[PDB]
RNA sequence: ACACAGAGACGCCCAGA
RNA sequence: UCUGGGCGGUCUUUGUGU
């Protein structure tokens, strides 16, 4: 309506004013809604408006009741345009036209109505519209708009004299209209009615997928616009880029894009590599001349024997050549005493039994003469501290004793220069000969007494564990849990676990003593709390060695562990003593975790051999061998020890190689080099050599049975005993029992510097093979441009075929959106960033200063403080800094892995911002690839599974499948970082090239810090005498005696030009490997088409690729016996030619690859053996004890639950899950101070009073469904069935026990460097909308940063390695010194008494309101709890080798945000919105539309707690392994292997029974929640005028929108009065196209639909669908298959079962009715 | 004792003889 | 080379992705 009257009524007097916000609610009565007929075209959406329904209150003058139309591009403002079009005047002007330019960057955006004709003013009446149901969101919108538009106007005020400006804001919502210019109630009513009718139009229009998936709002368009503006105005100064980085000319990119691939070179090179591969495969694999398989195997065995003997001779020639040595693998005594109690006759016989005897006697004399206090803590003294709220001796050791101790490292620094110490040091470096006699290790492994019963079931430690386990099982006390508990007791009464108990106690007590220091000659003596073993301890410091000597009376040792693998013990008169041994912080974790490790090992290797936990059987040879091997690996904890058994997987996968090809296990002799320093290493190496000889002698026998393919003849990697396939795969994985987190000494940092340099120094001198020309015999780091063009074109063809034509525009828009939506804060994280700069280059200046890495969060917050809020506004500054620097800065360390040796690089702050854009670009490009899995996880378990279906469909029954599991070597340093730029720039638009090329061109000069301490100890070592050229290379490179290109005179860095870094260009290299795999796929299809005699071989080829590990799968069908051999030969040639085709692409095939394997593939350690999927369970079983350093006590339990779930999903039965949860309980209580605190039993007794998990109680899963339910499920069960619910209800009615680690010394400092305000809580409270959205301004980003830094995740992120020793070192004072915090400092005994004195003031239970508030998922918890009583006793039968994968399965966050702030986040319409909000109000009565009303009248003081509450309100799904009512089936099948415990038609019958019985609520919602589909209806009801039509109406238009099989089915329908036909069809999920088509046709024929009329649309399309049949997407005719609430009458028909779902016309549609 | 085809660690900072 | 004392979320130490 009129604007001049609205403008002229205001009068400006002095200057700029904001006005007064007037709020006008609904005052006058409102009519209904006019009749609206909306139709969506291919170019616009148009509305016909009917008569206004009886405007008795003069409301509706603005509407015209005629015809209106809008565009698709203008549709997203369908409210903001149509509501406000009466006041809209076409101006297209900015204030910059009427005000002089102040150069503030505000000269381009039109700010809505800016009517100027009032005495020379500008008003800028700027407009808005919201869906808020309250005032708080309206106030937030007003504040956001005024903050957006206030500052530039005030900046532009002062340019002219006497300003007259008067800015204003209008906001319209359903609840009312708030403004600031003078407005009367009538036009406010008009605007609100226009808003209601426009919202109705928008609701009708939201049944169109062109608008549902349209751009959300102006935020996405503005992000795309700013990204476009940055990308079109970014000058990287390319001449400088060429001047400072090598190989940075644009001409490489121009010639790659312009000059096509030379077909003649490709044709010549392919036949050259084909004949080379044929010659190599004949020569190496013995085909010329012709021979049988047997003699081929014998001569391959001869080659293997010769190669192993050559390696043995080479290792023996560099050793000390000794065939006998007395060395113990386990350096701990074999004592297994009987612990009784605290027990602190010729004490002179120890003096003359050596130096250790002298020390022990002169210590025990001080013990007897001195004070008992100090050795152990008195219970009374510790109890006197909690309620009321170390022994050191200096013996005069002799010179001989001091020298003997210094020989073993005790005070060895002072006696370094003596002759004996120097001789010991010289002999220490000697390598052991491989021919050393190690028969004792094999004798111990084969025969031992580790699993024999120890008979201490009535022991106090076992009594404590038993009572705690009985209390944990008291709430579930049935027969099955009792049987498995008794089995755990038997596993706790073995000899090995009883030895491990006192060993773990010693390790934990050493970890406690690691923080103590002693003077020269002082020692610390203690007694084990249970066992009568005395420990003498020499502490140096925490980061150095701890020394210990053990002593025990000869009468207290009841029995010993058999075997000669133990170190010699000194035999004195009445005591047995052990020499001084050393440990470190890293080595203690394995010894702490020892009894749990043995318990889990016994459980796993007991069930894997087929004996039940509840059966009694004597241990066999192989079980003892596996347990002893695990014991020795855990006790030794050395990298070279586990490397040999790690390589056994790659060695033993070669036994699956099919003819014609021989097994090649002797290719791994290259990685088996290196010195051997222990007897166990020698034994493992010889067993590995024997395994290679046995593998080369005979392959694994692949037997085709009646319905499945099986493998026989498989055997253990080390012990060599014949076992099953699963046992072999698991035995490949015993080497991960070593700790990941191994502290690396400085002397090992040099050798890991080799891999950076040893491949850099061989850079080719000519860069004309680095991307310029073509080469048929390429050196490493070189590649062919033509081959890269061919592979890139092949992947381009694949992407265009899969995602339709003009896909580059979609890729451009998604890349622009992804870049624009990124802010500064998302890249801020608690990951380490480098601090290396130009000031750190010269060692002559940084010799004293020590280098510390900073946090990325701190630097990103520093950039936030400087007024940088968007990501694109920092990349330019980062590139300016990097280009001025001239190089990219990197700092290194070592990865704490198991698979080998690996260096890890860390960027500075500048390079990360540049790398992030390229990373997102490459990820978005790889998302289009149909065989890339790094960005598409769903393809990991899809391509392998669907290959069988494709082979069955295309080739039919009887298909031979041949696989190749390729792995690349040196994936990072091999790729010269010009290939990746070319590959990325092939797929990207033309205007994005000049940033992609630059950002990747900075990887060609890498500037890497080396360790400063390494430089300090190398500077004073200018003379080197090592038998390795790299050591002297480092020495004279640092000292400048020679010239190298990778280190200069006195520089703290190394230069690296060739190669990328690890994972830094992960997605781009994934794209490159996808291109290579696509080229190989096309080439393989071509060769299978051209045949071998000219007759084609009918076969299917598909490839999968990740980062460097790929797999090629080829299924072929021979037609005869003679054809099969030739076809297998041809396929073997094709799969072998990749090893020579890869160097043309610069990829080097490793010896880790297993080529030409039938019915077997490995991709990501996921071994697919035909229809039997194999996972290594031992990795997750060994992963069940590393926990994160957390502050709350229950968080330890939830971490244990997470690790337990990880162990369950790896393929473990529920019995192992229960047993390893028992071991987790034991581990948690030992960390609580079970073996280090005198006051545990009383603590134990106090847990009689209260089983509170927050106070230190461990909850246990139900043994039938253990691991699959979280910790919160156990908490819920305990609250319902025990008295814990009373305590929780009392605590809630009154208104958790958490401990600070280091009292937040670092955290607070991390706060103080940021400078964040301490008053941010009220700023969050006053604008509730700062969350639930992303960001809009600098202040809200700062507030979100302050919210991020005050989070549990960032709190539990400053923890360092060796978490278990640091946790257990606090176990001596966790109970009896004030360390916990309650919701000041108080000991946990005090917390238990405070809980106990309030236990008398307890009553009732948890009402439904509190348990719904606290325990949000209670419904499915009860549903899964009520499905467990059907099987409760050990009743069943023994009847598994068919293990496959199985899976077991609006929300309030969107609802609250939409209601309170009007942000579109829900699919549901207004009716369902009101219904869901009413249900949420029924859930919590304190909720209200006003945010302030909910804040003030709620239990949360500020909005952040409310936000975390809503986040915690909002599904748990678990993946298992087993054979192919579902819950009952998987529980019955997955309890124990081979043992049973006592479209889907069945689901359709269940739904029908529910419909006839009406057990639940709406049957439509029950069907939808059951994942069945077929729910929806019309939105244009096919307008019906008169009967003469074909069904009265059925003419003109019509759309059916609904959900079937989780899709957005939006079938367009149209009739001409004589027939009805579909027009366009849209689908969301393309999982099962054929079943969806069948269901669609079945729905269609019930109403009557013809597909004769094809279409009128020839645009973008993925599949074109003719009549009831799939056709090619663009051939002819068809229709464009496109990928992007009331129940009144369910009557039935006759003679057929029917469900009347008649939506808007007299025809019945069927859901699942049928006959 | 740990690390290593001999680079390290086996204590480190403080005023006093 | 001795004398007194002080020393822990110490440092080493943890990157790119899923
Ligand atoms: O922790 C990791 C592990 C793997 N990766 C990335 O994944 C790649 C493959 O991981 P990889 O174990 O195969 N190492 P690679 O350099 O290929 O040599 P090799 O072990 O002999 O085959 C590596 O080259 C890294 O780029 C990481 O970035 N971080
Ligand atoms: Mg690899």
Automatic annotation (TrEMBL):
Ligand binding (Mg(2+) 2): 967-968, 1108
- Key words, A-Z: Host endoplasmic reticulum, Host Golgi apparatus, Hydrolase, Magnesium, Manganese, Metal-binding, Nucleotidyltransferase, RNA-directed RNA polymerase, Transferase, Virion
Could you tell me one molecular function GO term of this UniProt entry? RNA-directed RNA polymerase activity
A GO cellular component entry from the record: host cell endoplasmic reticulum-Golgi intermediate compartment
Give the required cofactors.
Mg(2+); Mn(2+)
Q: Report the residue ranges that make up the RdRp catalytic domain in this protein.
A: 951-1154
Q: What is its EC number?
A: 2.7.7.48
What Pfam families does its record include?
Bunya_RdRp, L_PA-C-like, L_protein_N
Binding residues for Mg(2+) 5, per the UniProt record?
A: 967, 1109, 1162
List positions binding Mg(2+) 1: 126
Per UniProt, Mg(2+) 4 binds at: 967, 1108-1109
Query: Which residues are noted in the entry as Mg(2+) 6-binding?
Result: 968, 1108
| KW Manganese (keyword) present | yes
Q: What name does this protein carry?
A: RNA-directed RNA polymerase L
Could you name the domain of life of the organism this protein comes from?
Viruses
The keyword Transferase appears for this protein:
yes
What function is annotated for this protein? RNA-dependent RNA polymerase, which is responsible for the replication and transcription of the viral RNA genome using antigenomic RNA as an intermediate. During transcription, synthesizes subgenomic RNAs and assures their capping by a cap-snatching mechanism, which involves the endonuclease activity cleaving the host capped pre-mRNAs. These short capped RNAs are then used as primers for viral transcription. The 3'-end of subgenomic mRNAs molecules are not polyadenylated. During replication, the polymerase binds the 5' and 3' vRNA extremities at distinct sites.
Q: Where in the cell is it found?
A: Host Golgi apparatus; Host endoplasmic reticulum-Golgi intermediate compartment; Virion
- Which family does this protein fall into? Belongs to the Bunyavirales RNA polymerase family.
GO biological process, alphabetically ordered:
DNA-templated transcription; viral RNA genome replication
Q: Where does Mg(2+) 3 bind?
A: 967, 1108
């Amino acid at each position: 309506m009129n604007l001049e009257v609205l403008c002229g009524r205001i009068n400006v007097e002095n200057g700029l004013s904001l006005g007064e916000p007037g709020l006008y609610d609904q005052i006058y009565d409102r009519p209904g809604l006019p009749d609206l007929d909306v139709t969506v075209d291919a170019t616009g959406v148009t509305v016909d408006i009917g008569a206004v329904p009886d405007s008795a209150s003069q409301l509706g003058s603005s509407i015209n009741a005629g015809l209106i139309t809008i565009q698709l591009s203008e549709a997203y403002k369908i409210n903001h345009d149509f509501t406000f079009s009466g006041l809209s005047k076409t101006t297209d002007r900015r204030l910059s036209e009427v005000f002089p330019i102040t150069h503030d960057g505000s000269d381009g955006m039109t700010p809505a109505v800016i009517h100027t004709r009032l005495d020379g003013t500008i008003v800028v009446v700027e407009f808005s519209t919201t869906r808020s149901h309250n005032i708080g969101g309206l106030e937030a919108a007003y504040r956001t708009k005024i903050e957006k538009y206030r500052d530039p106007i005030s900046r532009r005020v002062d340019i002219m004299e006497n300003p007259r400006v008067f800015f204003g804001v209008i906001v319209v919502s359903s609840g009312g209209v708030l403004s600031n210019m003078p407005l009367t109630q009538d036009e406010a009513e008009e605007l609100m009615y226009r808003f209601c009718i426009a919202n109705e139009i928008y609701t009708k229009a939201r049944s169109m997928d062109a608008d549902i998936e349209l751009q959300k709002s102006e935020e996405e368009l503005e992000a795309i616009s700013r990204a476009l503006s940055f990308f079109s105005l970014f000058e990287p100064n390319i001449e400088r880029v060429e001047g400072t980085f090598p190989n940075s000319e644009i001409k490489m990119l121009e010639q790659f894009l312009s000059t096509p691939a030379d077909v003649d070179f490709i044709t010549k090179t392919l036949k050259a590599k084909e004949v080379e591969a044929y010659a190599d495969l004949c020569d190496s694999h013995y085909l010329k001349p012709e021979k049988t398989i047997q003699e081929r195997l014998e001569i391959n065995r001869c080659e293997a024997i010769d190669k192993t003997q050559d390696l043995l001779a080479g290792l023996h020639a560099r050793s000390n050549k000794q065939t006998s040595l007395n060395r113990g693998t386990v350096k701990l005594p074999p004592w297994l005493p009987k612990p009784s109690s605290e027990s602190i006759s010729g004490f002179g016989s120890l003096m003359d039994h050596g130096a250790y005897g002298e020390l022990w006697a002169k210590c025990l004399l001080d013990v007897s003469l001195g004070n008992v206090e100090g050795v152990v803590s008195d219970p009374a003294k510790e109890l006197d501290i909690a309620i009321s709220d170390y022994r050191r001796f200096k013996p005069a050791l002799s010179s001989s004793a001091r020298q003997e101790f210094s020989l073993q490292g005790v005070e060895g620094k002072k006696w370094k220069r003596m002759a004996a110490n120097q001789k010991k040091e010289k002999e220490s470096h000697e390598t052991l000969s491989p021919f050393l006699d190690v028969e004792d290790i094999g004798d111990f492994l084969t025969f031992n007494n580790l699993l024999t019963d120890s008979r201490y079931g009535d022991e106090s430690i076992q009594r404590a564990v038993s009572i705690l386990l009985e209390k944990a099982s008291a709430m579930q006390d049935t027969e099955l849990t009792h049987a498995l508990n008794d089995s755990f007791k038997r596993n706790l009464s073995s000899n090995v676990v009883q030895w491990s108990l006192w060993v773990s106690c010693l390790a934990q007590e050493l970890a406690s003593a690691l923080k103590q220091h002693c003077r020269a000659g002082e020692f610390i003596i203690k007694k084990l709390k249970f066992w009568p073993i005395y420990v003498i301890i020499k502490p140096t410091k925490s980061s150095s060695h701890i020394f210990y000597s053990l002593g025990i009376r000869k009468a207290d040792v009841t029995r010993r562990l058999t075997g000669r693998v133990f170190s010699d013990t000194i035999d004195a008169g009445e005591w047995e003593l052990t020499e001084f041994k050393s440990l470190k912080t890293c080595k203690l974790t394995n010894l702490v975790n020892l009894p749990c490790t043995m318990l889990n090992s016994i459980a796993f290797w007991r069930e894997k051999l087929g004996v039940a936990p509840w059966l009694v059987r004597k241990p066999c040879s192989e079980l003892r061998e596996q347990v002893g091997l695990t014991f020795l690996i855990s006790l030794e904890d050395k990298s070279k020890t586990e490397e040999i058994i790690t390589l056994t997987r790659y060695t033993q996968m070669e036994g699956f190689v099919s003819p014609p090809m021989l097994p090649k296990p002797q290719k791994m002799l290259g990685k088996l080099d290196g010195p051997l320093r222990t007897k166990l290493q020698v034994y493992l190496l010889r067993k590995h050599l024997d395994c290679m000889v046995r593998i080369a002698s005979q392959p694994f026998s692949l037997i085709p049975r009646e319905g499945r393919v099986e493998w026989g003849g498989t055997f253990h990697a080390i012990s060599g005993r014949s076992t099953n396939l699963e046992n072999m795969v698991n035995s490949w994985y015993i080497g991960y029992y070593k700790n990941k987190e191994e502290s690396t000494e400085l002397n090992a940092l040099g050798e890991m510097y080799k891999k950076i340099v040893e491949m850099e120094e061989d850079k080719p001198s000519s860069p004309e093979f680095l991307g310029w020309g073509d080469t048929d015999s390429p050196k490493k780091h070189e590649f062919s441009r033509s081959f890269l063009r061919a592979a890139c074109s092949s992947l381009e063809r694949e992407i265009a075929q899969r995602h339709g034509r003009q896909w580059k525009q979609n890729l451009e828009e998604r890349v622009l959106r992804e870049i624009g939506t990124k802010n500064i804060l998302d890249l801020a994280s608690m990951k380490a960033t480098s601090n290396f700069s130009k000031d750190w280059e010269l060692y002559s200046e940084v010799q004293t200063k020590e280098y510390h890495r900073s946090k990325l969060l701190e630097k990103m917050a520093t950039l936030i403080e400087k007024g940088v809020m968007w990501y694109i506004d920092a990349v330019g500054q980062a590139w300016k800094a990097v280009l001025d620097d001239g190089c990219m800065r990197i700092c290194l360390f070592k990865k704490n892995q198991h698979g080998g040796l690996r260096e890890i690089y860390v960027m500075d702050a500048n390079a990360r911002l540049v790398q992030f854009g390229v990373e997102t670009m490459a990820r978005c490009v790889c998302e289009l690839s149909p065989h890339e899995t790094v960005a598409n996880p769903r393809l990991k378990n899809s391509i392998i599974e669907n290959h069988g279906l494709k082979s069955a469909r295309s080739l039919g029954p009887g298909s031979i499948n041949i696989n190749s599991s390729n792995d690349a070597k040196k994936w990072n340093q091999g790729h010269y970082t010009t290939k990746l730029a070319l590959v990325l720039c092939w797929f990207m638009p033309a205007k994005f090239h000049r940033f992609i090329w630059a950002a990747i061109s900075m990887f060609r000069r890498k500037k890497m810090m080396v360790d400063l301490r390494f430089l300090a100890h190398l500077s004073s070592k200018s003379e080197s005498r090592s038998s390795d050229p790299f050591r002297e290379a480092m020495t004279d490179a640092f000292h400048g005696n020679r010239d190298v290109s990778w280190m200069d005179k006195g520089r703290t860095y190394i230069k690296t030009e060739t190669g990328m870094m690890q994972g830094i260009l992960h997605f781009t290299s994934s794209l490159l490997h996808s291109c290579v795999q696509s080229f190989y796929k096309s080439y393989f299809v071509s060769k299978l088409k051209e045949g071998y005699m000219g007759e084609s071989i009918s076969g299917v080829v598909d490839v999968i690729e990740g980062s460097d590990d790929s797999a090629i799968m080829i299924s072929i069908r021979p037609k005869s016996d003679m054809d099969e051999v030739r076809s297998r030969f041809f396929v073997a040639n094709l799969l072998h030619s990749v090893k020579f085709l890869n160097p043309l692409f610069g990829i080097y095939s490793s010896e880790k690859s297993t080529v030409n394997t039938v019915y077997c593939v490995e991709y990501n350690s996921e071994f697919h053996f035909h229809r039997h999927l194999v996972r290594p369970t031992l990795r997750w079983i060994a992963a069940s004890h590393q926990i994160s350093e957390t502050e709350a006590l229950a968080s330890r339990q939830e971490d244990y639950s997470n690790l337990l779930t990880q162990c369950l999903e790896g393929g473990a039965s529920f019995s192992l899950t229960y047993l390893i949860q028992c071991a987790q309980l034991l581990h948690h209580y030992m960390l609580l101070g079970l073996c280090l605190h005198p006051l545990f039993g009383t603590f134990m007794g106090m847990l009689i009073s209260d089983p509170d998990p927050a106070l230190g109680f461990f909850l246990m899963d139900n043994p039938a469904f253990a691991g699959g339910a979280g910790f919160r499920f156990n908490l819920w069960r305990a609250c319902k069935t025990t008295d814990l619910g009373r305590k929780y209800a009392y605590y809630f009615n009154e208104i958790s026990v958490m401990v600070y680690w280091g009292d937040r010394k670092k955290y607070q400092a991390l706060l103080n460097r940021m400078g964040l305000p301490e008053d941010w809580v009220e700023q969050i409270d006053e604008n509730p909308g700062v969350l639930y959205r992303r960001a809009a301004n600098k202040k809200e980003l700062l507030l979100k940063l302050a919210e991020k830094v005050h989070s549990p995740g960032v709190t539990s992120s400053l923890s360092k390695g060796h978490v278990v020793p640091r946790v257990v070192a606090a176990g001596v004072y966790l109970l009896s010194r004030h360390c916990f915090r309650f919701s000041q400092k108080a000991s946990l005994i005090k917390l238990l008494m405070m809980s106990s004195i309030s236990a008398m003031k307890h009553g009732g239970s948890l009402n439904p309101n509190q348990e719904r508030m606290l325990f949000p998922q209670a419904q499915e918890y009860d549903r899964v709890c009520t499905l467990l009583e059907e099987v409760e006793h050990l009743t069943g039968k023994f009847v598994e080798r068919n293990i496959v994968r199985s899976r077991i399965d609006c929300k309030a966050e969107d609802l609250v945000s939409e209601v309170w702030f009007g942000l579109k986040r829900t699919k549901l319409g207004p009716r369902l919105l009101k219904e869901e909000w009413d249900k949420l109000r029924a859930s919590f009565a304190w909720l209200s539309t006003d945010p302030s009303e909910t804040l003030r009248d709620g239990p949360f003081l500020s909005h952040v707690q409310f936000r975390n509450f809503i986040a915690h309100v909002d599904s748990r799904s678990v993946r298992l392994l087993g054979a192919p009512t579902t819950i009952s089936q998987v529980v019955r099948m997955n309890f124990f292997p081979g043992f049973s415990l006592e479209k889907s038609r069945t689901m359709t019958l269940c739904l029908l029974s529910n419909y006839l019985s009406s057990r639940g609520g709406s049957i439509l919602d029950q069907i939808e929640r059951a994942q069945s589909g077929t729910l929806g209806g019309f939105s244009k009801p096919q307008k019906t005028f008169v009967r003469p039509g074909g069904g009265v109406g059925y003419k003109g238009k019509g759309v059916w929108t609904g959900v079937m099989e989780d899709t957005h089915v939006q079938i367009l329908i149209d009739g001409d009065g004589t027939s009805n036909w579909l027009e366009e069809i849209r689908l969301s999920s393309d999982a099962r196209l054929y079943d969806v088509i069948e269901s669609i046709r079945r729905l269609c024929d019930d109403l009557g639909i013809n597909n004769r009329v094809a279409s009128a649309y020839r645009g973008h399309c993925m599949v074109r669908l003719s009549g009831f049949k799939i056709k090619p997407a663009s051939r002819t005719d068809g229709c464009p298959v496109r990928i992007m609430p009331d129940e009144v009458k369910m009557r039935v028909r006759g003679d057929i079962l029917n469900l009347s779902v008649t939506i808007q016309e007299g025809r019945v549609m069927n859901i699942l009715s049928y006959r």
